[PDB]
Design a protein around this ligand. Structure first.
Ligand SMILES: O=c1ccn([C@H]2C[C@H](O)[C@@H](COP(=O)(O)O)O2)c(=O)[nH]1
Ligand SMILES: O=c1ccn([C@H]2C[C@H](O)[C@@H](COP(=O)(O)O)O2)c(=O)[nH]1
Ligand SMILES: COc1ccc2[nH]cc(CN(C)C)c2c1
Lengths: 287, 285
């Protein structure tokens, strides 16, 4: 029964062989394919990629940050995780015409949409209690009361709020599904950096599925990863060709160390990655 | 290496062999798989399924109805296409607590979202000019000025408006992509009836892609169909097993009979399906 990581590596091989040259905003260039799908099992395994070490602390702190409803990059930065800091910087905010906005205010991004979809975004420090649709909690309620429902969806893509965001969301939406006491999740990702982001993104939503499964007393099932523009940056090709030489090691397991009743109560210390034996990281430039 | 209609037929075979028995809202029951994807080429071909005749007039009138921004089921019904009528009926509207709403008012469904996303929905007859985001026109503008953009998206799923809709959308969102003068489209469909709906749905978005390609002077590329809950109802299994035994005929072509500048100007008579040779329909409840 073949290792789950071979699907990701397979997508890299497909983009390298069949992808087409395409320019982007940074003028690095890409090889790109439109429309891909991979399926990663979550049964007695957690799909944290082994051919290159994935930044696990980042995955976990960012997810907890989303779940709090936070849109303050400084709040994620306090936890050791810098991945949203460039997008919240005075310079980057000024380049979007948000001169009046405080540093770190990303606008109504993921945290805001999951917890207060459709509320009037004022700033990051504001009180949004009871405003908008709490999509995350409604997903959890529906899994509990009506698991066979086909509307268990969480949408981050909000065309009305897009002009206020520092970055339009990659993770447009995700859908949940229940059968035989197993919870699965599909993610529609409109744009995927296969070198840097994708492994991280797989881990983010695998972890979300494990958390919701625990709250609802279900077993994790599959994570389905669907991509729109799936691209490799040209400066990542040599690093990626190195990574493709590495045999994957078995995926680790994720233990949840205590019983937890509401999703708001999860803390970083509640999670233990057990058996993670990645090969060494390879450097790959971003902005 | 399987192509065209063989992808759809392949998904039917996969659900029949690997799908899991599941109850649904109606308690008829289904075989179901979660997460599927198919790729249909649009280059010198139009993916209107041949193993069972697809209701072409319905596809076309409904798409033009969406594009107008209409949310009035009676307006689609006037054109011979009844598929939204049950959802706009006085009884069905009363069962959702919309006793004050006129018959046919489906609420803020596709039409409204594509043209006025985020506007305050009052009723179907109201004037929504300049209100909300016009996602359809913004897709067209972006394809013209910045084809390499990865944000060319049209979203029908609006959690704030869901409680006002007669039906929550199947077609959550769709995304466009341009490379080498070819326009492609991916559709995220959260729930797919593989027997009745899916063939129709493929045709709907293939046609949308052809229309936008024409306005933007691009050639059609691929249509990618992504599904969430992909199911076959149990009463459709015997009919579907019959359909799987039919050899597909080549896909037809779609001609666009005149030059058209804005997407609002397309009319039913502008479109010609040429070479369509389907097998006879099979009935499905
Ligand atoms: O969680 C994320 C956030 C961003 N990106 C990527 C994809 C693109 O390479 C780039 C953003 O491009 P745009 O689609 O925003 O234009 O960063 C990811 O892969 N995952
Ligand atoms: O254009 C459409 C509209 C609806 N359906 C389907 C899927 C389900 O069988 C049913 C909707 O059920 P829910 O997913 O809303 O629960 O209708 C389609 O396939 N295509
Ligand atoms: C309060 O007005 C708003 C603000 C942001 C929004 N995003 C989506 C909607 C949809 N709504 C008009 C029903 C919205 C409304």
């Amino acid at each position: 029964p073949p290792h789950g990581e071979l699907q990701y590596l397979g997508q890299i091989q497909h983009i390298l062989r069949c992808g087409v040259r395409k320019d982007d905003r940074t003028g690095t260039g890409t090889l790109s394919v439109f429309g891909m799908q991979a399926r990663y099992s979550l049964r007695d395994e957690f799909p944290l990629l082994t051919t290159k070490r994935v930044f696990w602390k980042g995955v976990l702190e960012e997810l907890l940050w989303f779940i709090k409803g936070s849109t303050n990059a400084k709040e994620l930065s306090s936890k050791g995780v810098k991945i949203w800091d460039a997008n919240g910087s005075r310079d980057f905010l000024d380049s979007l015409g948000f001169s009046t906005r405080e540093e770190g205010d990303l606008g109504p991004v993921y945290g805001f949409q999951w917890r207060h979809f459709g509320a009037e975004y004022r700033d990051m420090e504001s009180d949004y209690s009871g405003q908008g649709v709490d999509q995350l909690q409604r997903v959890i309620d529906t899994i509990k009361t009506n698991p066979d429902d086909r509307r268990i969806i969480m949408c981050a893509w909000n065309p009305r709020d897009l002009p206020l965001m520092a970055l339009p969301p990659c993770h447009a939406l995700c859908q949940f599904y229940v059968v035989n006491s197993e919870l699965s999740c599909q993610l529609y990702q409109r744009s995927g950096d296969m070198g840097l982001g994708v492994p991280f993104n797989i881990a983010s939503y695998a972890l979300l599925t494990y958390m919701i499964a625990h709250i609802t007393g279900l077993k994790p099932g599959d994570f389905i990863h669907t991509l729109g523009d799936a691209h490799i940056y040209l400066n990542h090709i040599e690093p990626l060709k190195i990574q493709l030489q590495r045999e994957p090691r078995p995926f680790p397991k994720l233990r949840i160390l205590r019983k937890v009743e509401k999703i708001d109560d999860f803390k970083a210390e509640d999670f233990q990655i057990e058996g993670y034996n990645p090969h060494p990281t390879i450097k790959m430039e971003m902005a």
